[PDB]
Write a protein that binds this ligand. Structure first.
Ligand code: OJA
Ligand code: OJA
Ligand code: ADP
Ligand code: ADP
Ligand code: ADP
Lengths: 723, 474
């Protein structure tokens, strides 16, 4: 209805004053791009930015960053009146002053250390009366523009003189500082954070609406994850980006206070935050204040918890206070904290993943002035088990190396070291590797829940089985209208059975990767640890973990591992049942229908599998993953060799048919036997590092076939019965 | 408030609870409602601390101290009745108890109606479909399922505008209409909750859902219905009816449906104890949980308490050569103890079902226990036609496929083996429907392709074992 057409959004692509705007209509505003444009703020403020195109931007909204947003005093999800006018007029020698407390970063020349690279070729239009951010030399600072000769705005080129001041002045307190953390300062690309967005949008960005309409906004939210995974970021950066007042109930701060004034300090916490609305109260270490499990040593702690429960229920539906609370494990906190109206929603922050850990490594080194060679993606792989705090420490520890090395050899210093004397330091791969060596992670023990990186290409052969998984996994969620028609419920389970090494685990990961579902692998040593420790009550949390990670594929490796531990020829006198596989049955039947969770079992020995596993409503679909043939062997060879570079003379079609009965893993042995020899050559040749036809011949001298031919019959026999 | 009196300091915590009953004296009639009674009186004689000893004692005095002037009723809520102190149940304290329990499928519809009656729903969603998906949700989950589906549509439509004043217009919010996509999204984010809790529900399966088994159907009604409907007759001969029935037969012949259908007919609660649940008490060597299964049954009365797979523990040890031990073991022993200890037949009927009657502890079968052995055999093609018809009454079927022939061709199948075929063919129809748009109906050739995989679970030598066990029983 003649609407303007502007919405404000986070911008993931990394730019100082650049904007994306939707292709599905480029003709309404009609900007060729690179054309100076208006932006309408609040209060009487405006901004000027440059526009680019994105296939993956929405027709709905507009990618722009945190420096433009703070200038306008716009926020996310907000709308600013916008108008194109193409024109722009050049200007002179733009003038610059330090802003706020920040300063002392630069000693002497401060436009050598800062300006030259950023106004270079950019044509960054720069306004009177705005703040912007220059990064470099392990620090960030902002230069206000108080005086510009041409107005309202000026495009800049390096034909102009350079004027300098460099003396600080207090910035207005009403302003929102750019160091206060916000969405971009949170890394990991978990996308889970997007879930907290949907919860806190309306309640604390639109307070007056909930007095108009009956609905129940959530009062509490639990973040949980191991320490250092960014739980305090999320609260700080939701409260900062929405304008709500952030409060902080230090888990042990209220504990450090004496009996009877400990409650006084927590209760006034919610009373203050009442008066500020909307507000997030963020209790961290909730398991400090409310860790009672009905077990409860002591006295005082009974009363701290009760007061908190009253406070969390006592929220009086005047004002908006959202109470976010973080803890390491959700079993840790008192069970009465989850009742309706207390902490209703929970979020698992969890360990980041490989291509999640890249972003954290980008956010902690963006001021560091890196070397070219290291791209951070290589270190991102080595880093599994690290959490965002480990990674911020990996970077600070690699940044403190280079200071130790270069620089202080000089010892030259005054009350503040010059900004430029520290420019020549550039963090290097040797620094990072040294840093990786001293990390000490941490979270290695925690289970892994990740979208797996293996794809369909990584699987040679198995084309039909690949289709059949997509049938079982994808059609019920994509076409529920069809399954409802016949009243049929899809299967939740699949049991892979076959000889060892034929690609059952990759086949499970590849379908989770395709759906970009989380993958949780429970391995035979993990089912054996519950069985030797005769604690199968931990099966529930594996499942609870799966439910929280949904949509996921929950994969059980080696699901006969316990039947083997007893036997598997004559076994125990007992039948096929036992304590752990029994709980898996209990927890499959107890699942709340099929809700984003798909189960895949895999076994070498279907003989010894408890036949109750195979019943209707459990893992009904038995799929037989057999040994490859030489068509699928050519594909397996090609699929393994797609990484390590290969010299063209070696022939990959012949190696196949010559190895008559190998499993897929037996071909990995050969490929790994030959790549070993190439490294064996490369390192011995410099004391020409490529892989040769004769290595796969020397590798072949050791070629071994794991799966004997009598048992192939056992598989076929088990399979030939199954019809 | 259970924790409100707790939040107060020592010595003024009692002052606050005692004045609670003194005020409510002056107002009559009045309900005092203590919630989280297990906060104020959770002591089991275990009792960490000091203060809590005295909070509980004051409450006991208060609950006994009701002076028969005025009327004060004290209602108190708690999560499990074992949680609260045992002295709270003595005569004159909390004498009556009520189990509210999880709602059931056609119960959950009404909650979904009461929380969305202001919402201005779309036509398509009737709420009965979501009511089915919702098992494990409780009324609070469902009020949250609706508020979460109502907050979706506000997020979507509407605020795109941003038009607002001190109060948004009543009509500007009229155009928002909650949709199935909103609800499904909501179902996706519910997080229930109560999934673990045992299920006690009138089952939805009827007599029609059971092909065949006409005589056995009569005999259940005899055992279940006549003693309660005609107690004047059983008293005449001084005869006490049987409390139990043991179904025995091959796997998949409809023993579980037959148990649910008689509970459905009586509109009795149905409690299914499944073999993995008897195995969990046995591996965890906690059979003291058999009592609460029964206590739960007593509270749910009239119910049919059904034990699936009642030989599952005998198999876990053996079932050919077994343990050196005899047929007894810890869990089946408590079931014997708790059957004999039942307060007569009071709305609770027990049904055991087993595939292996060989390995059943013969003490199960004694007088006063599960005396009536009924043999549920494999169907014949009359009952196979009925089983086929009974399964296919839901999923729509195109008339050309012939259901009389498929029967007699499958010579030895159990009832569950025919479900495999019907499910094998309905799978292929969905296989067609989704691949045809990238005409969704079921065909005579699908039951032919389904039949290519047709498998017979129950071997013919063991049918003899059943008949043999049966042919002995006379
Ligand atoms: C065209 C494209 C750009 N659009 C966006 C991408 N989507 C991909 C659709 N992927 C879906 C959603 C995730 N999947 C998934 C993940 C994890 C578990 C399950 C799952 C659980 C489950 C339980 C059952 F009982 C039965 C089936 C089940 N599937 C599904 C299914 C495929 C395409 C459009
Ligand atoms: C005509 C119709 C409209 N009227 C109303 C509906 N009633 C139906 C009568 N249904 C009765 C009551 C519920 N039943 C029931 C439910 C659960 C358990 C038992 C039961 C326990 C038990 C224990 C024993 F030791 C022996 C027998 C037992 N039966 C009975 C029996 C049939 C008709 C009139
Ligand atoms: N996922 C992440 N992305 C970016 N930075 C992170 C992340 N996780 C941790 N950090 C950094 O390390 C610190 C994590 O500590 P904290 O916020 O206390 O996490 P938690 O609340 O889980 O203990 C933060 O100061 C933040 O700068
Ligand atoms: N079909 C296949 N395609 C590609 N690689 C395979 C295949 N089968 C086996 N492999 C290789 O052999 C190894 C063992 O396979 P795995 O997935 O562990 O099978 P399983 O779980 O059945 O033992 C894998 O690391 C993989 O690289
Ligand atoms: N007589 C029957 N009538 C209708 N369906 C049957 C019959 N027997 C078996 N079935 C089908 O086979 C499945 C298995 O039956 P079930 O009740 O589990 O028998 P059991 O408990 O003896 O294994 C049921 O879901 C049912 O749909």
């Amino acid at each position: 209805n003649r609407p303007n057409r502007l919405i404000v959004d986070e911008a993931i692509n990394e730019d100082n004053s650049v904007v994306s705007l939707s292709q599905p209509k480029m003709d309404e505003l009609q900007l060729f791009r690179g054309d100076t444009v208006l932006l309408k703020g609040k209060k009487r403020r405006e901004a000027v930015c440059i526009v680019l195109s994105d296939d993956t931007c929405s027709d709905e909204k507009i990618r722009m960053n945190r420096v433009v947003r703070n200038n306008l005093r716009v926020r996310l999800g907000d709308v600013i009146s916008i108008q194109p006018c193409p024109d722009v007029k050049y200007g002179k020698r733009i003038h610059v002053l330090p802003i706020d407390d920040t300063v002392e970063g630069i000693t002497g020349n401060l436009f050598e250390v800062y300006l030259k690279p950023y106004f270079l070729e950019a044509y960054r239009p720069i306004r009177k009366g705005d703040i912007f951010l220059v990064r470099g030399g392990m620090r960030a600072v902002e230069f206000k523009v108080v005086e510009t000769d041409p107005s309202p705005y000026c495009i800049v080129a390096p034909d102009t003189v350079i004027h300098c001041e460099g003396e600080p002045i207090k910035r207005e307190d009403e302003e929102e500082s750019l160091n206060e953390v916000g969405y971009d300062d949170i890394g990991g690309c978990r996308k889970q954070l997007a879930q907290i967005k949907e919860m806190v949008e309306l309640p604390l960005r639109h307070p007056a609406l909930f007095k108009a309409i009956g609905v129940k906004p959530p009062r509490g939210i639990l973040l949980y994850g191991p320490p250092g995974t960014g739980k305090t970021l999320i609260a700080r950066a939701v409260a900062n980006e929405t304008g709500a007042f952030f409060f902080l109930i230090n888990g042990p701060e209220i504990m450090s206070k004496l009996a009877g004034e400990s409650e006084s300090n927590l209760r006034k916490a919610f009373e203050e935050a009442e008066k500020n609305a909307p507000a997030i109260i963020f209790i961290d270490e909730l398991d400090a204040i409310a860790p009672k499990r009905e077990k409860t040593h002591g006295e005082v702690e009974r009363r701290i918890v009760s007061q908190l429960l009253t406070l969390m229920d006592g929220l009086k539906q005047r004002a908006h206070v959202i109470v976010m609370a973080a803890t390491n494990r959700p079993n840790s906190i008192d069970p009465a904290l989850r009742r309706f109206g207390r902490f209703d929603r929970e979020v698992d922050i969890g360990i980041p993943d490989a291509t999640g850990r890249l972003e954290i490594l980008q956010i902690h080194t963006k001021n560091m002035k890196l070397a070219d060679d290291v791209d951070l993606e290589q270190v991102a792989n080595e880093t599994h088990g690290h959490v965002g705090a480990d990674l911020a420490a990996l970077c600070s520890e690699a940044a403190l190396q280079a200071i130790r090395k270069k620089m202080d050899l000089i010892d030259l210093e005054d009350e503040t070291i010059d900004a430029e004397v520290m420019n020549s330091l550039a963090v290097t791969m040797d620094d990072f590797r040294w840093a990786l060596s001293q990390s000490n992670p941490s979270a290695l023990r925690e289970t892994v829940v990740e979208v797996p990186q293996v794809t369909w290409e990584d699987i040679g052969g198995l084309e039909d089985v690949k289709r059949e998984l997509q049938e079982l996994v994808q059609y019920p969620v994509e076409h529920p209208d069809k399954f409802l028609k016949f009243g049929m419920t899809p299967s939740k389970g699949v049991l892979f059975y076959g000889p060892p090494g034929c690609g059952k685990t990759l086949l499970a990961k590849a379908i989770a990767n395709e759906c970009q579902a989380n993958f949780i692998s429970i391995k035979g040593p993990e089912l054996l640890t519950m069985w030797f420790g005769e604690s199968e009550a931990n099966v529930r949390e594996i499942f609870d973990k799966a439910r929280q990670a949904a949509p996921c594929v929950l994969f059980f490796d080696e699901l006969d591992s316990i039947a083997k531990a007893r036997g598997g020829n004559i076994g125990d006198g007992g039948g096929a049942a036992d304590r752990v596989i029994n709980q898996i049955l209990t927890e499959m039947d107890g699942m709340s229908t099929k809700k984003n969770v798909f189960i895949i079992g895999a076994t070498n020995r279907p003989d010894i599998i408890d036949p109750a596993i195979l019943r209707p409503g459990r893992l009904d679909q038995l799929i037989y993953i057999p040994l490859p043939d030489e068509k699928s062997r050519v594909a397996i060879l090609k699929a393994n060799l797609r990484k390590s570079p290969v010299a063209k003379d070696v022939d990959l079609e012949f190696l196949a048919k010559m190895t008559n009965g190998f499993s897929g893993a037996d071909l990995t042995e050969i490929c790994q036997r030959a790549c070993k020899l190439a490294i064996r050559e490369s390192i011995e040749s410099e004391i020409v590092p490529e892989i040769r036809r004769d290595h796969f011949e020397e590798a072949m001298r050791f070629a071994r076939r794991s799966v004997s031919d009598n048992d192939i019959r056992k598989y076929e026999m088990f399979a030939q019965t199954l019809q």
